[PDB]
Amino acid sequence: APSPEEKLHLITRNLQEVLGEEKLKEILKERELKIYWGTATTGKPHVAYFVPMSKIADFLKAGCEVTILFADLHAYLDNMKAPWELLELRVSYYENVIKAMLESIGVPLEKLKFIKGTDYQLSKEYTLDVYRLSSVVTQHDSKKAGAEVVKQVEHPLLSGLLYPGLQALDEEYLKVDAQFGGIDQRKIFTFAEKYLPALGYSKRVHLMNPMVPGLTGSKEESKIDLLDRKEDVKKKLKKAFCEPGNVENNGVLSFIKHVLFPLKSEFVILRDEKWGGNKTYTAYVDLEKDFAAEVVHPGDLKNSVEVALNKLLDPIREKFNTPALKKLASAAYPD
Amino acid sequence: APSPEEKLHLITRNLQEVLGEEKLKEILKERELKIYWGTATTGKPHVAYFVPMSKIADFLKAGCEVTILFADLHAYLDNMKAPWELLELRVSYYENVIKAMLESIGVPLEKLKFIKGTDYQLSKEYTLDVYRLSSVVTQHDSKKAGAEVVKQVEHPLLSGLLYPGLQALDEEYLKVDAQFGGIDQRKIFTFAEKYLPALGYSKRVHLMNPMVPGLTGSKEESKIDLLDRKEDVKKKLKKAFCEPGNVENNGVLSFIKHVLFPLKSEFVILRDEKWGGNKTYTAYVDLEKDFAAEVVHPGDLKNSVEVALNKLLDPIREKFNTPALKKLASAAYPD
Ligand SMILES: Nc1ncnc2c1c(OC(F)F)nn2[C@@H]1O[C@H](COS(=O)(=O)NC(=O)[C@@H](N)Cc2ccc(O)cc2)[C@@H](O)[C@H]1O
Ligand SMILES: Nc1ncnc2c1c(OC(F)F)nn2[C@@H]1O[C@H](COS(=O)(=O)NC(=O)[C@@H](N)Cc2ccc(O)cc2)[C@@H](O)[C@H]1O
Question: Where do the annotations place trans-resveratrol binding (chains A, B)?
Fold first, then answer.
């Protein structure tokens, strides 16, 4: 039975920014927070998705009612990042792999709600609100709201202007108090705080993670897929940006900070007896200090992350080791 | 039983431009043409609406299946020219006054179909097509398609970009072969010819009237309302631009050309015996020649139009002389 103060700590730890602290505290004084996270069903999710999933885990630990939105219409509206025929296959792939990630990090699925955008975003009342919103949002504001999220092409399409407006309306139709996403969503979040009240709807609390550098190319591609075999995880980890003593733009350290510490509350560095043997850290700042002092070597850091990451991936790889899930993976991502 | 050639003449006479003559003739060789005309339910219709209604009459004379669309959602999308609360009152006013105009010029209403946009434009299949269209139409093309139709404001709204796309989709959902409107619709019509095939839908024939100068200020406001009393019709007609011998930008002559000649097939100029007495014209070009020669005086032309216009308005004014229609007129246009 966590106190409102303990819930607030669980909910907001590791975030880059909280908008709406006043209302957030008002809610936690009385009841559970209702929050959602959305993802457009576009490319294959990679290990970076453990970063938002670790905050989802925190939200459930705090007692929140959590909704996960598979934003299939949004994937279509974002420059057809998922063509319309493949959408429902993409939703199935996303649902299976996101549930597998949550099961792997021990998140109880029975208190989560999963919904796909097209379950309600084609309804008459929602569509009427899209038109009501379109009558107050300028073309200027919808273009700028999506600048960091929607793909920016030479001749922008009308769909790209619709995208942020629907993401705002989703807060009302999912009946939430708050929306969580990475800080790349910030301009959509502030757009929603401005325009939802123009429709008679309350502004929501917005919770924003930092954009965490990947476990590969410095801060694009070459990422680690959730279904990569151990040997491919090992190979990709060797090439990760991880300079000795350099605690910035370090995707290996960032994964520890945002995924492994919240999961386990500790992190063990594997190290030879010659250099002091293993050491258990209870706080990220202590590990960071040792890495800056160069008494945690990059190779030992990578070794330690490799062991923990393969533990997270093992049940996922097992789950997708089914004839039906192998066919789904290939069918959702053909050529 | 008019021939295909006689139907084509009735359908296309007095038009400024026909797009799709090849397909138009292919259809008339086999069956009746399916056509619609739409109007956004915004301001009170004035006597200029007799110009499109006279072409509707021609279409029915040619045997066409005609739909009249009361585009209520479009009125809302066009800079809220009709706010959402007043829309259904505006639709009722438009339906009553348009049916009255057609009855006045002797158009049989029983073979016309009347539909309001929100009967189908909020449906799931239509909304899906709006999103499919938005994924191919650029912001650039939708802005330019509506440049002469949608109000151009300093900070354009998203609704204004949606407007031409929905007008294009209306051609498919109303299941027509052709759309009729004034030539101010041309950029929406060519937009529809370009983009409907991107959705797997056929291009439509487009029929365009000329933009006829009003019976008032030269070629805005001061117009004659369909419910104006005889005395107000008389007063407004006195101030109409009608210079002797000047057959251009002459709203009085244009009304004769586009409304009175199609209705009656003749036009009688009322003139004193001293100047030759009355004369009946069987063709507009003969009247124009006499006006250019200054043997039809502006006052006599206005007198002759006044008599005919009050005949067209009399049954409309009688129809709206009901307690329920008086309340409707005031409720749809308050303050
Ligand atoms: N490296 C990282 N570090 C920290 N957070 C990260 C990443 C990362 O990298 C990536 F490559 F995986 N993504 N995320 C976060 O997870 C989510 C990704 O999902 S998304 O598909 O991008 N969704 C969108 O864009 C949203 N508009 C979709 C949407 C649509 C309608 C709604 O009503 C609500 C939402 C967003 O919150 C992202 O910030
Ligand atoms: N002086 C004149 N001479 C000759 N024709 C004239 C005029 C005139 O003057 C005015 F003041 F009355 N209007 N018209 C013509 O009648 C119609 C008016 O209706 S409207 O409300 O303007 N409709 C729109 O704009 C259309 N986008 C509405 C629409 C929406 C969805 C659809 O699927 C189809 C259509 C249009 O065709 C106009 O050209």
Answer: 36, 167, 170
CA distance B274 to B265: 27
* Residues A55, A116 within the same domain: yes
Buried b (16+ CB within 10 A) or exposed e, A78-99: bbbbbeeebbebbbbbbebbbb
Q: Is there a single domain that holds both residue B32 and residue B173? A: yes
- Residue B217, domain member (yes or no): no
The closest alpha carbon to B95, from B163, B39, B170, B36, belongs to B39
CA–CA dist B223, B232 (Å, integer): 11
Residue A101 token pair: 């990630």
Q: Are A251 and A189 in a shared domain?
A: no
- Tell me, yes or no, whether B214 lies in a domain: no
A residues 100-129 lying closer than 8 A (beta carbon) to B: 122-124, 127-128
Spatial distance between the Cα atoms of A207 and A184, rounded to a whole number of angstroms:
12
Residues within 6 Å of ligand 2 by CB: B 38-40, 42, 48-49, 51-52, 69, 71, 74, 149, 167, 170, 181-182, 184-185, 209, 211-212
* Rounded Cα–Cα distance for residues A130 and A15 (Å): 31
> How many CB atoms within 10 Å of residue A150?
25
CA-based R_g, chain B, Å = 21
Q: What does the alpha-carbon distance between residue B208 and residue B166 come to, in Å, rounded to a whole number?
A: 19
Full strand arrangement of the beta sheet holding A65-71: A17-19, A205-209, A178-182, A34-40, A65-71, A112-116
Technique that determined the structure: X-ray
- How far is residue B10's CA from residue B13's CA, in Å, rounded to a whole number? 6
The answer to whether A73 faces chain B, any CB pair under 8 Å, is: yes
The CATH number of whichever domain residue B25 belongs to comes to: 3.40.50.620
Same domain assignment for residues A203 and A73: yes
- What is the distance, to the nearest Å, from the Cα of residue A58 to the centroid of all Cα atoms in its chain? 13
Cα-flanking dihedrals φ and ψ of residue B37, to 5°? Answer: -135, 135
Residues A280 and A313 in one domain: yes
Whether B142 contacts chain A with CB within 8 A: yes
The resolution, in angstroms to one decimal, equals 1.7
State the distance from the centre of ligand 2 to the C-alpha of B183, rounded, in angstroms.
Answer: 9
Is the same domain home to B169 and B240? no
Domain that holds residue B89: 4-209
Q: Which ligand is nearest to the CA of A37?
A: 1
| Residue B294, in any domain of the structure | yes
Smallest-distance ligand from the CA of A38: 1
One domain, residues A151 and A298: no
